[PDB]
Amino acid sequence: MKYASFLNSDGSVAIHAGERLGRGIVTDAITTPVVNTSAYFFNKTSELIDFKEKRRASFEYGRYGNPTTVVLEEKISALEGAESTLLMASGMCASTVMLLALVPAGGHIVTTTDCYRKTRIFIETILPKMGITATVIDPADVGALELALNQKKVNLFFTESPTNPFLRCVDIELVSKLCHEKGALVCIDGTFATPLNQKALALGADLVLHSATKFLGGHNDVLAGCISGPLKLVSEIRNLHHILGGALNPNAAYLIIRGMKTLHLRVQQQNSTALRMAEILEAHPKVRHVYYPGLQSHPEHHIAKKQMTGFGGAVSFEVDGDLLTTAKFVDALKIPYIAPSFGGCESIVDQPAIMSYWDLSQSDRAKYGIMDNLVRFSFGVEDFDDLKADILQALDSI
Amino acid sequence: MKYASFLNSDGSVAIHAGERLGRGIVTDAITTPVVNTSAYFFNKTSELIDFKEKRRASFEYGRYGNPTTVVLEEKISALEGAESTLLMASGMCASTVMLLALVPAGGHIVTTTDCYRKTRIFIETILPKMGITATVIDPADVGALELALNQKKVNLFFTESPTNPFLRCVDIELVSKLCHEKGALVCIDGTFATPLNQKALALGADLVLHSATKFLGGHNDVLAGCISGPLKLVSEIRNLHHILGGALNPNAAYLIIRGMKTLHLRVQQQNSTALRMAEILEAHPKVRHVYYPGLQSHPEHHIAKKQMTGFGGAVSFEVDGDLLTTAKFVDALKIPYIAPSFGGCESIVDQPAIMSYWDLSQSDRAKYGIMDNLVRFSFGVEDFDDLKADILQALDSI
Amino acid sequence: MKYASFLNSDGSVAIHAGERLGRGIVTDAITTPVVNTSAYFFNKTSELIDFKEKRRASFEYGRYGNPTTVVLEEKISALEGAESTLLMASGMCASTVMLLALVPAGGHIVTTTDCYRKTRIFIETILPKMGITATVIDPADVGALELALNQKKVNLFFTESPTNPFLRCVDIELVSKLCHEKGALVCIDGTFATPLNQKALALGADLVLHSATKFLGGHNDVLAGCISGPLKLVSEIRNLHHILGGALNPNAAYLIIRGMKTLHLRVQQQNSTALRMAEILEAHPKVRHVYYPGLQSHPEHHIAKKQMTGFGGAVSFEVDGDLLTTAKFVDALKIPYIAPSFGGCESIVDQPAIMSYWDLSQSDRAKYGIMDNLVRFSFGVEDFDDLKADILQALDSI
Amino acid sequence: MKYASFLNSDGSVAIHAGERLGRGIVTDAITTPVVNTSAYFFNKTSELIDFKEKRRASFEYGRYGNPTTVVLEEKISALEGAESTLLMASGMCASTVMLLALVPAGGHIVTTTDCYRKTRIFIETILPKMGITATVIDPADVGALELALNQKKVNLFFTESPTNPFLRCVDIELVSKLCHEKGALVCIDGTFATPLNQKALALGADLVLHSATKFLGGHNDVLAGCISGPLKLVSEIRNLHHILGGALNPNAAYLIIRGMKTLHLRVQQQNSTALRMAEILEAHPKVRHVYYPGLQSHPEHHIAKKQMTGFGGAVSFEVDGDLLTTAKFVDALKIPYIAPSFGGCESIVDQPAIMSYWDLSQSDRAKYGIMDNLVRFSFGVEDFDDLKADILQALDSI
Ligand SMILES: *Cc1c(COP(=O)(O)O)cnc(C)c1O
Ligand SMILES: *Cc1c(COP(=O)(O)O)cnc(C)c1O
Ligand SMILES: *Cc1c(COP(=O)(O)O)cnc(C)c1O
Ligand SMILES: *Cc1c(COP(=O)(O)O)cnc(C)c1O
């Protein structure tokens, strides 16, 4: 292992990890300096060779590293207790480069039916070009996973947990055991969880990736990807990264480094407001169903308590109406923004049906759980009383 | 007033005030855009005249305003419930331009003996050049204040509350009543308080100013000044501001706007860690004395209790030793940085005697409460446990 | 197409294109605002649907667009006279996404032996998984391009011009004609040229791509990729871009927008110095050979003369000596930095043999023109004399 | 002394001064890092004392210095060949703090009738409060300067050169001689000149100040002040600066440092385009008069030519018409923005009468040379022919 022996809490680590004990870019400043350079120089050809023969250290070129960015790399690696972390231009950049680098051509992949749409698309339209075939199972169906592990020769099992938008959870520890038994790799996307509500690496997953665009940055003002794990693995991705070059700008790395100084304070507040609002809603006449790993209704709520310490700040529920009525509800809200993304100080609402499946036919949408009813609420950091009042006032107009 | 009728808590306000309902710089973005421009253009001379005849609105020149900065102006004005707010390059810039604009040549000023040093210096070396004579009383001595208000024709009473470094408090409501009776103006520097722990304006003060470099920004990465109050008054300062031009850079205004999205979460935490640690220290056999409005041993813990809701994140205490021993203690700490300033996520420690009065003789230092013993601790946002352990471990080396 | 009818010079265009006539993000500011947002909101579900049915415009999510970035997109599109431009995280990101989006699986690609190493690697190790196969010819050998354009069906001919590090040039017009005859696509990497020294699009190329990390940004403080061309084509890449998500940060987009305000002034000076010094060196005894399209000795000086108004700021030459001696020369220089990259105000020197092929055996290096002799000089914007003096003084130590 | 012995041109200096040989903030990066911190920490009380006893170096607090800012301080000091330079929040901030720090209470000041308005106001409404009396002479009237230098005791002679908006010049060398004879101090505002077109320090002036908001930054996206001169003098201002705290933000310091990498390339084009267009304008039947030091009709063209290598990028001329007609002209232009400020890549036009004296009566305006006729043109860096075409086309509508 860990950063500091005098830092035993994730909050204290999220703050000082990668900085308090030293930075690499020496300063007597309190904060990390933003280094805007596209290249690094050498004093003499002699030293350039040293570095080339691994006798000296240097990023050499901007596509291969940056001082103000490694800090953020070491900081996250600490939280996840990972051996090494790789930062990218975005979440989709992290998932994509990782799949291309770890799954061989032709090899098999296994994921749930709740896989992030964009990623599903990439897995079903691009990856096949290399013979890579897959198996889409149910988040819960471990039997399915078990079997696929035997007929086909699975290369990697990829899944998020919680899941979007129904927040389905996966038993990281159990799933990790099965896969490794048959040699498969396990990668968990803890975007909704956060490295504070769960330690996918600790539970057995080989790699844990995030979309820092959400909770990590937490201020809805920057995109970024995340992938932590063992050097041996993460460095294989880092290589293909140096070729595809989806590098992260130092200014972005800083906005995140800064945003993580209050990761704990933020996540804590979201967790409450979330849980608390869940119950209120689930017990509302105008709310048909409510999805939240905290509720007892949740199918894997037993897994949520056994592997998570918090249940997140995202809550999905179905209003008692139709596309139009549900819409009237979200239009009635006054604090959240009707927009995509989640995890930031500002609250956000959206109808997954209209916001991300409008391109499909009502039958094709429902073909995968998405209903005109479904509403996805990302609870901000505003006052619980202010929020709740707003949600209720809105449900009344329905 | 109130920004929004659906926003009743300071936390929700600190977040959406000046943005949620509209910005002036129209966007469909969630955040405020950083506008890096030194000048604003007009479409045709016709429109330039309109503006000149107050028929159109424009900042015209950068020294007179900026889109990404008014947001922060309107945001703070909301929290303080002020009619208008003016942002500057720094805290000292705010105090200084205000004194120069509101106190006439020859006029009289009244402040406590605990007045911020730099400001005391400005009041005792610069202001006299303009005939401005001053009276220095004790923060508590309300009698002296009442006499000055009677002998001389006081122009303005300026004081911070809490005070530095002993955190002395002033009865804003009482003091405000006396002054206004004799026509004096009252300006309170709520830097240590924060617009969350108290409402200087509500209690009667005419103007409340802050040093956003501390708690408002909260990330130890930007300097800024603050002055909120009624238009009639704050606009008089704004004018002199356009001539002295200590403008605030848009990039600074944004780093603060961002920093204020978690003001409540941060202050709240800082309020605990402080009060609690204040109690442990008070009961420690190695700590000679402890200053904190939250404690009962505080001279004005009774005034602080009635006019404030929280007690700040700063705690001053005297170790049981001398310059050298006290130093050994701070050198023993492992989490805080030995440095100036306070109010940010990172904890900071300093010995006011060495850090700000080393230029004076031991006799001149003690001539105003500063002892080689005194330690000033700005509690970060790290875990209370990690913090408590560190402070104790250090006190043991003594 | 032309941006403005009142702007007839590339210099005036590089400056006002995408801004002077309007921005989309309305302001009375002179410059483009940096919009730091990860998502864009909608006023009511109604408007969200409009947008979804192409009745309204919005970027929706940050991975799909940004106000402060389109400006830079429209600005470059103007310079190249392109129908549309796409900006990415880096040069390698631009090349890579384009290849993956335009060349089908099993398809065929054709490029020169002077192809950018990293890109060659991607073409020889990654692309093959998709069944894609390539044909590597000589920059000059047009007969080969002709044969290859026949024996096997070519999907796209990709080449840079000038080339690195020998600056070989390709007859864009001729080459474009042959390919299109056999239905192949033509993509030219004008990195070294700049949209000012040549118009690959005008000469017939379908797509022209750049690495804005070099000349476009011109200050060695930001990475970025570029791809301009017809909507029909560039939009196909833009799509795969929204999945692979190697988005460009708004802060980067601005640093480049800003850097292009002096693109013309910079390229001009770099152009003169390059040429003149090119000449001086060629006559210098200690200098063996000199590569520069400007010189009369350049194999394709006629094509350079024919399709370029400028010859760039990069000059490659071989010192009279060996790895060690050549090194002693570059170590003797005092103004340039020994480092990778080029195109910025600061001059830079490097020995391609040590800096990018050290991983290969002397025999494998020479196996492709790279010699321990070869030096690559990127002329800055410093004064011509200061530079000449320095280069001569250094050549004397040899 | 000078910066580097291998850098003999102002262009090479503007680029590498304060960086090429070292920065203080150690890096292997090519550019200067932006250090966003409000405080600097110490390793142990021991070292804090060292620093306090001038045995160690540190900025201590942000109001007292910053790493990314000193670079810009050392860079400008090099250009002006000054002993030390102080950077502020704006030009007005630099002028103001300097006057308050150098002119004693009751002291006497001497300046021209063409003094920057804002500054004149400060000198005529604030300074008198401390009894600082002033003498306003004609830029040319040296006899008056000799008399005032002999009647009342002059403390400092302050003037800009060229002047605004008529660009009047002052013989720095002669004026410097007279003042120093009578002990007066000489401060020259070279804003319009630039440290490239003249060396006020070399000509004898004690202090030379600039408004980096104009030419130095050159991109119309940042405000900043400047004051260079001998340590003994500049440090006296730096002190009062630490109290009034109108500090410069590191992000601003960087935008300027970056903007100065092409100071020479930009000033060159502005120098030409200006001069040339001045002639063409004076030869036009619709232009009543033209002010430019480079013209032969300029009252001090003989002094300009003698102490200047360029004449600036600003040109003021009077159209043959009235407020309304002149307006119709500027409204007809298509490239420049109708706005305040000057010195940047984008061209700007304005009518000093409407833009800065509209508050006065026609009689009061004319009371000081400002006519409804007067137009002030700040030539950008756009192409000369695009600029000339536009100006002519507009003059035709008149
Ligand atoms: C948002 C999200 C992503 C995409 O991350 P970007 O930063 O937008 O690329 C991937 N996975 C999950 C589960 C997400 O919620
Ligand atoms: C820090 C502080 C100031 C000074 O503010 P700056 O931002 O440093 O100028 C003024 N008053 C108090 C009470 C402070 O704590
Ligand atoms: C530098 C360069 C690239 C790579 O661009 P990045 O911005 O480093 O990814 C590609 N092609 C050429 C010809 C280059 O010179
Ligand atoms: C613009 C200008 C100033 C004012 O500088 P700011 O940066 O606007 O405060 C002072 N003097 C002259 C001569 C100017 O041209």
Catalytic residue among B10, B171, B189, B350: B189
* CB neighbourhood size of A216 (10 A): 27
Q: How many helices (H) and strands (E) does chain A have?
A: 15, 12
Transcribe D51-63 into DSSP letters: HHTTSS----BGG
Do residue C247 and residue C275 come from a single domain?
no
Do residue B251 and residue B265 come from a single domain?
no
Query: In sequence order, what are the beta bridge partners of C134?
Result: C109
Structural contact between residues C377 and C347, judged by C-beta atoms closer than 8 angstroms = yes
- Ligand 1, atom 2, lies closest to the CA of A211
The whole-angstrom separation of Cα D278 and Cα D312 is 11
The whole-angstrom separation of Cα A37 and Cα C254 is 15
- Ligand 3, atom 7, lies closest to the CA of C91
Helix (H, G, I), strand (E, B) or coil at C169: coil
Q: Measured from the CA of C341, which atom of ligand 3 is nearest? A: 1
Q: How many helices (H) and strands (E) does chain C have?
A: 15, 12
| Residue in the block written with tokens 């955040």 | B31
Do residue C53 and residue C174 come from a single domain?
yes
Backbone φ and ψ of A93, nearest 5°: -70, -40
The whole-angstrom separation of Cα D78 and Cα D196 is 11
CA distances (Å), origin A264, targets A79, A134, B194, B236, C217: 11, 37, 22, 42, 38
The whole-angstrom separation of Cα C96 and Cα C102 is 10
Structural contact between residues D335 and C16, judged by C-beta atoms closer than 8 angstroms = yes
CA D112 to centroid of ligand 4, rounded, Å: 16
User: Which residues contact residue B224 at a Cβ distance below 8 angstroms, ignoring those fewer than 6 apart?
Assistant: B87, B88, B89, B90, B91, B211, B212, B213, B216, B217, B248, B252, B253, B256
The whole-angstrom separation of Cα C205 and Cα B347 is 59
Short-list B72, B80, B127, B75, CA closest to B99 = B127
The whole-angstrom separation of Cα C40 and Cα C55 is 17
CA distances (Å), origin C159, targets C86, C95, C205, C341: 19, 11, 11, 19
Backbone φ and ψ of B339, nearest 5°: -170, 170
Q: Give the burial class of C146: count Cβ atoms within 10 A of its Cβ; 0-12 exposed, 13-18 middle, 19 or more buried.
A: middle
Supply B345's token pair: 């996520």
- Strands D348-350, D337-338: pairing is parallel
The whole-angstrom separation of Cα C87 and Cα C241 is 10
Q: How many helices (H) and strands (E) does chain B have?
A: 15, 12
The whole-angstrom separation of Cα D45 and Cα B351 is 9
* CATH at residue A292: 3.90.1150.10
Instruction: Please answer yes or no on whether C118 and A327 come within 8 Å at the CB atom.
Output: no
Supply B320's token pair: 């049981």
Backbone φ and ψ of D289, nearest 5°: -155, 155
CA distances (Å), origin D168, targets B230, D145, D189, D215: 43, 16, 12, 18
Short-list B391, B350, B341, CA closest to D48 = B350
Long-range (24+ apart) CB contacts under 8 A made by C11-14 are C11/C263, C11/C264, C11/C265, C11/D381, C11/D382, C11/D383, C11/D386, C12/D335, C12/D382, C12/D383, C12/D386, C12/D387, C13/C78, C13/C79, C14/C75, C14/C79, C14/C196, C14/C260, C14/C261, C14/C263, C14/C264
Query: In sequence order, what are the beta bridge partners of C229?
Result: C84
The one-letter amino acid at B294: G
Supply B173's token pair: 């409501």
Residues of chain C contacting B67 with CB distance shorter than 8 Å: 27, 29, 33
Short-list D330, D291, D344, D331, CA closest to D164 = D291
CA D87 to centroid of ligand 2, rounded, Å: 21
**Within an 8 Å CB–CB cutoff, is residue B255 touching chain D?**
yes
User: Which residues contact residue B128 at a Cβ distance below 8 angstroms, ignoring those fewer than 6 apart?
Assistant: none
Q: What is the dihedral of CA A253, A255, A256, A262, to 10 degrees?
A: 150
CA distances (Å), origin B88, targets B73, B210, D86, D239, D248: 10, 10, 19, 19, 11
Is there an atom of ligand 2 within 6 Å of B114 CB? Answer: no
The one-letter amino acid at A318: E
Supply D295's token pair: 């013209």
Supply B41's token pair: 């253009």
The whole-angstrom separation of Cα D114 and Cα A94 is 61
Structural contact between residues D93 and D100, judged by C-beta atoms closer than 8 angstroms = no
CA A162 to centroid of ligand 1, rounded, Å: 12
Instruction: Please answer yes or no on whether D40 and B331 come within 8 Å at the CB atom.
Output: no
Supply C76's token pair: 């470059």
- Strands C156-160, D133-137: pairing is unpaired
| Beta carbon pairs, A and B, within 8 Å | 124
Residues of chain A contacting D28 with CB distance shorter than 8 Å: 40-42, 58
* CB neighbourhood size of A24 (10 A): 12
Supply B121's token pair: 């210096």
CA-derived radius of gyration, chain A: 22
User: Which residues contact residue D143 at a Cβ distance below 8 angstroms, ignoring those fewer than 6 apart?
Assistant: none
H or E element that contains A155: strand A154-160
The whole-angstrom separation of Cα D65 and Cα D59 is 5
Structure's resolution in angstroms: 2.9
CA-derived radius of gyration, chain D: 22
Q: Last residue of a domain, which of C260, C286, C313? A: C260
* CATH at residue B32: 3.40.640.10
The whole-angstrom separation of Cα A125 and Cα A144 is 23
Structural contact between residues B315 and B379, judged by C-beta atoms closer than 8 angstroms = yes
Do residue A197 and residue A282 come from a single domain?
no
Buried b (16+ CB within 10 A) or exposed e, D288-304: bbbbbbbbeebebbebb
Query: In sequence order, what are the beta bridge partners of B348?
Result: B337, B378
Q: How many domains does chain A have?
A: 2
Q: Is residue A214 annotated as part of the catalytic site, yes or no?
A: yes
The whole-angstrom separation of Cα C161 and Cα C139 is 9
Supply B131's token pair: 């005939």
* Residue of chain B whose alpha carbon sits nearest to that of D254: B251
Asked if omega into B165 is within 30° of 0 (cis), the reply is yes
Structural contact between residues A240 and A101, judged by C-beta atoms closer than 8 angstroms = yes
Q: Last residue of a domain, which of D237, D260, D283? A: D260
Q: Last residue of a domain, which of B219, B234, B260? A: B260
Q: Is residue B254 annotated as part of the catalytic site, yes or no?
A: no
* CB neighbourhood size of C51 (10 A): 18
**Within an 8 Å CB–CB cutoff, is residue D202 touching chain B?**
no
Q: Ligand 1: which of C40, C63, C248 to mutate, most ligand atoms within 8 Å of CB? A: C63
DSSP 8-state code for residue D253: H
Do residue A110 and residue A246 come from a single domain?
yes
CA torsion sign for D387, D391, D392, D397 is positive
Do residue B255 and residue B268 come from a single domain?
no
Transcribe B80-124 into DSSP letters: HT-SEEEEES-HHHHHHHHHHHHSPTT-EEEEETTS-HHHHHIII
Do residue D24 and residue D129 come from a single domain?
yes
All partners of chain B with 3 or more CB pairs under 8 angstroms: A, C, D
Q: How long is chain B? A: 398
User: Which residues contact residue D314 at a Cβ distance below 8 angstroms, ignoring those fewer than 6 apart?
Assistant: D162, D165, D167, D192, D274, D342, D343, D376, D377, D378, D379
The whole-angstrom separation of Cα C38 and Cα A224 is 10
The whole-angstrom separation of Cα B229 and Cα B86 is 9
The one-letter amino acid at B92: M
Structural contact between residues C229 and C83, judged by C-beta atoms closer than 8 angstroms = yes
Q: How long is chain D? A: 398
Domain of D53 in residue numbering reads as 1-260
The whole-angstrom separation of Cα B265 and Cα B390 is 23
Experimental method: X-ray
Is there an atom of ligand 1 within 6 Å of C63 CB? Answer: yes
Short-list D206, D200, D210, CA closest to D184 = D206
The one-letter amino acid at C396: D
- Strands D374-378, C314-319: pairing is unpaired
The whole-angstrom separation of Cα B124 and Cα B209 is 20
CA torsion sign for B206, B210, B215, B219 is positive
Q: Give the burial class of A44: count Cβ atoms within 10 A of its Cβ; 0-12 exposed, 13-18 middle, 19 or more buried.
A: middle
User: Which residues contact residue B306 at a Cβ distance below 8 angstroms, ignoring those fewer than 6 apart?
Assistant: none
User: Which residues contact residue B154 at a Cβ distance below 8 angstroms, ignoring those fewer than 6 apart?
Assistant: B108, B109, B110, B135, B148, B179, B182, B183, B184
The whole-angstrom separation of Cα D335 and Cα D387 is 7
**Within an 8 Å CB–CB cutoff, is residue A397 touching chain C?**
no
Structural contact between residues B2 and C2, judged by C-beta atoms closer than 8 angstroms = no
Do residue D241 and residue D356 come from a single domain?
no
* CB neighbourhood size of D25 (10 A): 21
Supply A354's token pair: 């209209």
The whole-angstrom separation of Cα C353 and Cα A125 is 40
The one-letter amino acid at B216: L
The whole-angstrom separation of Cα A294 and Cα A305 is 8
* Residue of chain B whose alpha carbon sits nearest to that of D130: B130
Q: Give the burial class of D361: count Cβ atoms within 10 A of its Cβ; 0-12 exposed, 13-18 middle, 19 or more buried.
A: exposed
The whole-angstrom separation of Cα A117 and Cα A123 is 10
CA distances (Å), origin D40, targets A29, B213, D47: 4, 14, 12
Do residue B185 and residue B219 come from a single domain?
yes
Do residue A134 and residue A156 come from a single domain?
yes
Instruction: Please answer yes or no on whether C383 and D261 come within 8 Å at the CB atom.
Output: no
Do residue D84 and residue D223 come from a single domain?
yes
Do residue A192 and residue A305 come from a single domain?
no
Q: How far is CA C241 from the centre of its chain?
A: 19
* CB neighbourhood size of A369 (10 A): 14
The whole-angstrom separation of Cα D332 and Cα C119 is 50
In chain A the first and final C-alpha atoms are separated, in Å, by 54
